[PDB]
Design an enzyme around this catalytic site. Structure first.
Site, PDB file in Angstrom:
ATOM      1  CG  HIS F 104      -1.764  -1.218   1.341  1.00 36.53           C
ATOM      2  ND1 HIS F 104      -1.303  -2.284   2.078  1.00 36.53           N
ATOM      3  CD2 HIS F 104      -2.970  -1.586   0.844  1.00 36.53           C
ATOM      4  CE1 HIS F 104      -2.196  -3.262   2.018  1.00 36.53           C
ATOM      5  NE2 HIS F 104      -3.205  -2.870   1.260  1.00 36.53           N
ATOM      6  CG  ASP F 205      34.944 -31.648  17.050  1.00 39.03           C
ATOM      7  OD1 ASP F 205      33.895 -32.160  16.588  1.00 39.03           O
ATOM      8  OD2 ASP F 205      36.002 -32.348  17.143  1.00 39.03           O
ATOM      9  CG  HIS F 208      36.033 -32.424  13.503  1.00 34.17           C
ATOM     10  ND1 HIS F 208      36.405 -31.246  14.143  1.00 34.17           N
ATOM     11  CD2 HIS F 208      35.687 -32.078  12.244  1.00 34.17           C
ATOM     12  CE1 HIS F 208      36.273 -30.241  13.281  1.00 34.17           C
ATOM     13  NE2 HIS F 208      35.848 -30.723  12.124  1.00 34.17           N
ATOM     14  CG  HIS F 213      38.323 -31.355   8.087  1.00 33.13           C
ATOM     15  ND1 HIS F 213      37.375 -30.940   7.166  1.00 33.13           N
ATOM     16  CD2 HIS F 213      37.854 -30.979   9.302  1.00 33.13           C
ATOM     17  CE1 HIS F 213      36.392 -30.322   7.804  1.00 33.13           C
ATOM     18  NE2 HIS F 213      36.666 -30.320   9.097  1.00 33.13           N
ATOM     19  CG  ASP F 362      33.039 -30.298   9.026  1.00 35.43           C
ATOM     20  OD1 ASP F 362      33.697 -29.336   8.581  1.00 35.43           O
ATOM     21  OD2 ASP F 362      33.481 -31.050   9.908  1.00 35.43           O
TER      22      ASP F 362
HETATM   23  C1  LIG Z   1      36.479 -26.721  13.564  1.00 40.58           C
HETATM   24  C2  LIG Z   1      36.972 -26.769  14.867  1.00 40.58           C
HETATM   25  C3  LIG Z   1      38.337 -26.664  15.106  1.00 40.58           C
HETATM   26  C4  LIG Z   1      39.211 -26.489  14.046  1.00 40.58           C
HETATM   27  C5  LIG Z   1      40.585 -26.349  14.270  1.00 40.58           C
HETATM   28  C6  LIG Z   1      41.432 -26.189  13.179  1.00 40.58           C
HETATM   29  C7  LIG Z   1      40.942 -26.166  11.868  1.00 40.58           C
HETATM   30  C8  LIG Z   1      39.589 -26.286  11.597  1.00 40.58           C
HETATM   31  C9  LIG Z   1      38.693 -26.444  12.661  1.00 40.58           C
HETATM   32  C10 LIG Z   1      37.323 -26.568  12.450  1.00 40.58           C
HETATM   33  S1  FES Z   2       1.656  -0.519   3.226  1.00 35.21           S
HETATM   34 FE1  FES Z   2       0.102  -2.092   3.593  1.00 35.21          FE
HETATM   35  S2  FES Z   2       1.228  -3.955   4.099  1.00 35.21           S
HETATM   36 FE2  FES Z   2       2.750  -2.339   3.905  1.00 35.21          FE
HETATM   37 FE   LIG Z   3      35.265 -29.751  10.396  1.00 37.77          FE
END
Ligand SMILES: c1ccc2ccccc2c1
Ligand code: FES
Ligand SMILES: [Fe+3]
Ligand SMILES: c1ccc2ccccc2c1
Ligand SMILES: c1ccc2ccccc2c1
Ligand code: FES
Ligand code: FES
Ligand SMILES: [Fe+3]
Ligand SMILES: [Fe+3]
EC number: 1.14.12.12
Lengths: 447, 193, 193, 447, 193, 447
Positions: F104, F205, F208, F213, F362
């Site tokens: 509007h 983490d 992992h 990786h 991941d």
């Molecule tokens: C997630 C968590 C820790 C990490 C440390 C080094 C490289 C990548 C990572 C990714």
């Molecule tokens: S001007 Fe009416 S919904 Fe935004």
């Molecule tokens: Fe990772």
């Protein structure tokens, strides 16, 4: 919904509320009271014959690893790492002595035990109690002539007792034939139906065959092909129907050993089955030998179905109230010639597999029946299963179970659904037993 | 030209098939193959299944679509059946399927289905040993629409052999498809790829 | 070559259209048609709608897209309007749609839409009666992406007539599409197929 | 949510909680209190004129079969088999004396009765009470000048009374013009909006036209084309707005008989409408004759909308809180020349159909407004509908209903939403009536 | 032929690219381009990534896929980085990605992925200034299926430059893709378009 | 579920119920107790440097407009029109003095105020109270060295206090380096994982990396590339882990300034970082200067993560329990040479963007871990985070917070999850504080 008191299935299994095929809350409740309580098909010996062989399987919505142990037994475990819960195994089948998690590298044996953890000594020292960190194990794993079933509930009856009166009918083919093999891998297809729709169809629905499958009967020229378009009702005495305490049931179409197979396989099958029946007459008697070569359409409660003789073997894997993942295997008799085993397996998939021309006939039936259970004006409506009611017997001298001595009827639906009500309204097996103490009386009323 | 010892993800089968097309390239064969496949797909899209059998399919046909079980890339010991046949049809079996499609009691065909096929990446090469055997490779997207709001889309590569038959017409003698999706999310695979 | 009495699922219209392409095949016409359609689709994909009208669309055009009501395969008595026109445009009506696309107060065009068209299965044949009329058949996948996470994919077969107009340029004089999905799941059909 | 006490719509309809366009629990509640209670558009006589003609229609999320009976009446039934619940009819329109279920072949007549069951005598004997197994029938089916509406609630007011004061405005076109035809089949498109978003837009939203549709106005060169980009506010007295007890309402833009039609049809329409108006002056009076050829944007509560003169006719079929299936038909006057009927129908679809360039302008408006009702910080926010509040009247000597004597305002929104609150907070029609006993007083406060 | 002052939705870049193809059309170049791209896509579909680098990719390649931020059609003042590079790879960077695909500890590649590519709308033109530089435009649908029920479909137009390199083989020296979906709904873009 | 009493996270953060990654009711509850309560990343100064510049951002599932005011401050508003709730702004970035609604035409300023309404005088007269109709404003907007965060809860602690002990670790790079720039636009990809899965992975983490990786480490030849396939555990003293009261935490890998960057950038980065560290030694001391050029993997609770030195900056935008929209930006030091800023940004996206070869490693980890939280047998299972428990300290003389003086462990998970429990079980910030009065004691038990 209060499942203690809600009447989802009426007395004698005569009707069911349509919502049972659509209600998501009920579906969640079935995970607990149906799938976590009862026996579920996993695999066959023929698929994991050697030590280290494994497959993955669904049990309800859970995924499990099913593994042949060095001592020859089979154990099954949740396919979930005990560390941060990643799925452990991403393939369907293989051979291994263990499974390593791709997240942090924890290694579990084929026996579920936590066997190694990367850098355990430097990281955890002696603090990690690996003996308490094995994969979550399926409490019960049992075999019915090579067919392996699992149950998460340690309180369940033994698989043989669970089969109840249905076992007597399966034994000629499963045991006395020399044994069956399951030919994998299965076909896998998702349908937009509730798992109960194909389960009920296979457990007891001969009525639909002539009409639903008119085109497949006409086109394939199989042995049951007279019924096309309901052109002809089978003779009196063409078969019977049966059901059992724990819900399993089946139809019997006498002598139909070639089943849904097209004319190309009919002569060879009818010859093979009849030759074996001749030998079985002397071993198990004429009636049981004839059952061996009779077409049985069966559901092993809750969600495993089969067509013996046709050799179709199905698992209706539940996803949600209107989604099911259909697994299709072929069953063959071990002593059939190899070339015949190959052709039968291909024919099973031709008719009932992912491109099965017969199975396609049932798609709309199952899907719309299920989806209509969600529709407002249909939720409280009653699906009817009264065909044959008041003519069923129990304790017959020749044929055990609750039996309708007619080829076409709804006996098996009534027994499937009385078992389903009893479970859905019960908190454990003891309560199911208490609710089932007069199971057969309930099913034979008015006779 | 591919060495599968180095190109670790490539299967022996796939390496063999590549080899057929990289060598002798004939632009004219590619054109003939494109026409054959476009005509085939038109007949199928209009549901002229009898016409398809008569004009496009050879009497000795093998029409095969497999679903391969998911196995570990490093698997070496488990040796059981690797795949199942979604289709593994001879001419008579195809004819049965065609009759099933055309039967007026095929309730699932009313209202009439709608098909649209898209054929791409056509390659063609004559066989080295049999001068009358044409290898054709092509990819298909197949769109199936029915019942208002059902829509299923299929994707596949097709490895074909075509040979001249009655009247000198080139006809399909082998189709092989390794279907790429393990669990189908299209209700069924009841379509001719 | 199709007999619709035997090939029970085939419509008279579809059988007629097949016939145009199976007879006189000219590889050169197929190539010209492929170029025409690829150029058309490029102009449309870059949203050069004025250029499209100027270079690709004939002054006497009929641009028609229908949606057919689902009826029983065995229906024979119910005779009311079988289809509606999603599009049934003359040149002026197309021009109106093009102006609507280009107006800077077309709020739905900001941010700019993204189109990608895939044209396949091209067939071409000259008309038997009018030597200047080219029949072209092709299939299209049209991908439309907007507003971050909206994605709509359209699938259709197109039955066209193209004729040489101003400057000897071949231009579209008729496009007919029978849209295969009855209930659209793409928000709208506001795309030029 | 307690719908007895929850204030979803504030006093006088002045505002609504944004969650009403997103809340799935409310949507389920609307199936009961809106869709199962009120009158819903089914079809037109022109689409099922002969005995045996039928169409399928949605009523809420339910699907029904609407069939012309041999005696000339129309009856409607749920499109669900009474046996195992399969959808009975899979096409949209046709002619038949009955419907056979493709699952087990049960055959129902055009009158809903269960007429045959395959092998009835051999299977059911005399046990099947077919007279109790007819299709579930829509309780009420009534016509407004050929436009057929259905209601699942036998307690509802007659359709004419339900239209309330809106009927007076529709009658010049629906009745005094000689009658209307609906040209099918409809366009069908799914949008990601709540059904109330297009319902409210059509019932009372003239404010959006100049801005939302700036490009369509400019490009089409239609009669309302001055407003493009809010270049010009219509004159005082260019129209009015009205609403009624049961929620139906409309805007009136005086004299705009060519409506949204592009310049190609303007001269012919303005000529045709004005010629008819000249004849109607003597029959229904000048004011009503002018209403006949005035553009009415109306919603017949809950989910049927129309633009008279433009000839747009819509059904906003609910799927879930953020999904609606839009059906678009064209309305034409029966006595228009055929060629004009054809061109008007094409123009309706050109502007408001699946590829309607006008309708496309509203897509983002409806979709985002609806989806934003799900967003956490917006659920409890208030959508405003106060434009014109305190200037509305009731009981005017010339124009009936609650009326705002201005072309642009929110009168019709307030009446749509006061009706909606009353239903959502009521268990039956008696309670709706009790909650609506001072409906017009509530709507005219501060005047 | 496009005037972007009139065709308000057309970008200068897109208008420039059109111009290359509408002028000198050579049907033979179009055919060579179709073969090159079909062969490339076959190698990629069978996961012969080393073969792809060796046969299809030039040592001086720039392989670039961008994601453009959604901005107002009427925007004129905000001048910050318009796009990010999903890919902007030289040969060595592509080689790293290929090694990553082939490493047997790439856990996501077991079970083996399945790829199917559909290449359409091929256009080819020689560069006006560099007689050895071939411009090729094509559109791709790429279907990726893994782990039973994961299916991802990618859609894009590709603007390439190909040049003859070692052994006289035409190899890719530049690929540019402006990815049409802003927010990817395919889990990642870890595919070679 | 009663979130006052349900133990979702066990004492000391030692384990969490798997359902937390799958339960939709909990997700809705997190919108309230996590996303509407805590500080959420919006943008950087570098992206809206001039008056009128704006961007859109998500805060939980809500969308906001973030705008540079004429006075140099930043304000943020819900991207929802105050009239009928349409989304106001459909682009991601731009420069404007206001925003006009396409429904509007209501016009709002960059300061959220309702500045104009079409035809206000003719339509509303003086009845519209525009001063009460400004866009719904984000209560709190604060900067951490150019990084702009927002919070809907006026009761929240200041952003600096909320960062708690984590701030000390970020300051060398965020403040003492001369400052950072965020290079946009971000990559945007939807993953089928719960937002907590990547949040926990980045907060703590390191375990992992070597396994998940393995392929990216081997193929890229980056500095952390010895660990490929867990070929080698880093030395003792290779880093540490820390967590804080309000849930933010990080890992520190000493000296790893080139991070995940491939060998092509390693020499230039190691040179640049080491040169700056040399200058910082004299300003902030050797330990803090070394932290500056050490790789920090951090999550700023709840859903913003980063890898300093690598220059990865992420927002895990929640969609539903198993859907997250991942936004990926690059961070660069303002005083780096332009060409280096460009190459680093491309490398961030090469490794961690939509086609990031590392981030792809991941995918399966996060998705399956999350989806398994829905599976029946896993809902009540315990995800383990006990690595390093009983060796963490608090109040160390050199390194603040709850600290595990080891490179690999689960310290940061425990602190993320103790903060999460406290919020999910609390109705407001006062209750969170009461539940957190012994936060560090809980985390260091058994030491
Ligand atoms: C997630 C968590 C820790 C990490 C440390 C080094 C490289 C990548 C990572 C990714
Ligand atoms: S001007 Fe009416 S919904 Fe935004
Ligand atoms: Fe990772
Ligand atoms: C389902 C139930 C019963 C049957 C009997 C014969 C053949 C197929 C069947 C399928
Ligand atoms: C919706 C509501 C009112 C209108 C008035 C005129 C034209 C189109 C309209 C659409
Ligand atoms: S999730 Fe399996 S090792 Fe960590
Ligand atoms: S479901 Fe209709 S006849 Fe059985
Ligand atoms: Fe069946
Ligand atoms: Fe509008």
């Amino acid at each position: 919904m209060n499942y203690n008191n809600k009447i989802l299935v009426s007395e004698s299994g005569l009707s069911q509320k349509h919502l049972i095929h659509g209600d998501e809350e009920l579906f969640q409740h079935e995970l607990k009271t149906i799938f976590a309580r009862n026996w579920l098909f996993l695999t066959h010996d023929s698929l994991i014959p050697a030590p280290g062989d494994y497959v993955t399987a669904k049990m309800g919505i859970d995924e499990v690893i099913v593994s042949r142990q060095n001592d020859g037994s089979i154990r099954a475990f949740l396919n979930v790492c005990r560390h941060r819960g990643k799925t452990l195994v991403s393939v369907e089948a293989g051979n291994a002595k263990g499974f390593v998690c791709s997240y942090h590298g924890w290694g579990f044996g084929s026996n579920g035990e936590l066997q190694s953890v990367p850098f355990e000594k430097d990281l955890y020292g002696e603090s990690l109690n690996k003996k308490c960190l094995g994969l979550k194990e399926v409490a019960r794993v049992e075999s019915f002539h090579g067919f392996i079933y699992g149950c998460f509930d340690q309180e369940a009856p033994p698989l043989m007792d669970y089969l109840g009166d249905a076992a007597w009918y399966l034994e000629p083919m499963f045991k006395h034939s020399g044994g069956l093999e399951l030919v994998g891998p299965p076909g896998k297809v998702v349908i937009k139906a509730n798992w109960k729709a194909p389960a009920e169809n296979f457990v007891g629905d001969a009525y639909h065959v002539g009409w639903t499958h008119a085109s497949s009967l006409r086109s394939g020229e199989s042995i049951f092909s007279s019924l096309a378009g309901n052109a002809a009702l089978p003779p009196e005495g063409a078969g019977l129907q049966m059901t059992s305490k724990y819900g399993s049931g089946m139809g019997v179409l006498w002598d139909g050993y070639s089943g849904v197979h097209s004319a190309d396989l009919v002569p060879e099958l009818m010859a093979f089955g009849g030759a074996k029946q001749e030998r079985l007459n002397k071993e198990i008697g004429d009636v049981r030998a004839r059952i061996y070569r009779s077409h049985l359409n069966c559901t092993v409660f809750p969600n495993n179905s089969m067509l013996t003789c046709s050799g179709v073997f199905k698992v209706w894997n539940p996803i949600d109230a209107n989604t099911t993942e259909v697994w299709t295997y072929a069953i063959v008799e071990k002593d059939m010639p190899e070339d015949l085993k190959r052709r039968l397996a291909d024919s099973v998939q031709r008719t009932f597999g992912p491109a099965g021309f017969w199975e396609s006939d049932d798609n709309d039936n199952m899907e719309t029946a299920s989806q209509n259970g969600k529709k407002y004006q249909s939720r409280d409506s009653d699906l009817l299963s009264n065909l044959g009611f008041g003519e069923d017997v129990y304790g017959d001298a020749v044929y055990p179970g609750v039996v309708g001595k007619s080829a076409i009827g709804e006996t098996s639906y009534r027994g499937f659904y009385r078992a389903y009500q009893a479970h859905v309204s019960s908190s454990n097996w003891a309560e199911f037993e208490h609710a089932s103490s007069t199971w057969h009386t309930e099913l034979t009323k008015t006779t | 030209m591919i060495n599968i010892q180095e190109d670790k993800l490539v299967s022996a089968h796939d390496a063999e098939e590549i080899l057929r097309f990289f060598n002798c390239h004939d632009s004219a064969l590619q054109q003939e193959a494109t026409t054959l496949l476009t005509q085939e797909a038109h007949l199928l899209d209009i549901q002229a299944y009898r016409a398809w059998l008569e004009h496009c399919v050879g009497s000795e046909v093998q029409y095969q679509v497999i679903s391969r079980e998911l196995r570990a890339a490093s698997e070496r010991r488990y040796k059981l059946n690797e795949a199942m046949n979604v289709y593994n049809e001879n001419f008579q079996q195809l004819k049965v399927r065609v009759e099933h499609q055309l039967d007026p009691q095929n309730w699932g065909n009313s209202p009439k289905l709608r098909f649209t096929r898209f054929i791409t990446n056509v390659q063609a090469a004559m066989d080295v040993n049999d001068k009358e055997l044409l290898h054709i490779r092509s990819n298909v997207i197949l769109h199936r629409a029915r019942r208002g709001n059902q829509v299923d889309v299929f994707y596949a590569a097709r490895e074909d052999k075509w040979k001249r038959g009655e009247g000198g017409v080139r006809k399909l003698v082998q189709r092989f498809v390794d279907y790429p999706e393990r669990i189908l999310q299209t209700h069924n695979l009841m379509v001719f790829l």
